[PDB]
Write a protein that binds this DNA or RNA. Structure first.
Length: 50
DNA sequence: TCTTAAAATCGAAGTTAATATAAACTACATAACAGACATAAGAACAAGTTACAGACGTATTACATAA
């Protein structure tokens, strides 16, 4: 049992949230690379639905 | 003749009922929807054509009455 671990609701919630965050981060990096960022707000860059 | 990667299999019922991310403008042709008209089909009324029924009228026979 020192070689097997317990993973609870907090850990897997964190894991899935991090997966969604990476999913957002890919598109955010794609958008930031364009350059035209004069009229962009932080709420116009991320994607809450993933 | 000996490794080494693939290929295939692994009990019945029973229950069970799904998800959820990520160009715009313009030009043209076609299909669909609505309205109106004509047509075909049925409903209604009235008449005509025809035979039979229902009770009457007639014809026939038998009884009664008159000579």
């Amino acid at each position: 049992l020192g070689n097997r671990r317990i993973r609870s609701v907090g850990e897997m919630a964190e894991n899935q949230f991090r997966v969604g965050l990476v999913r957002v981060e890919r598109a955010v990096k794609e958008r930031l690379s364009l350059g035209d960022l004069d009229n962009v707000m932080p709420q116009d860059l991320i994607n809450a639905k993933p």
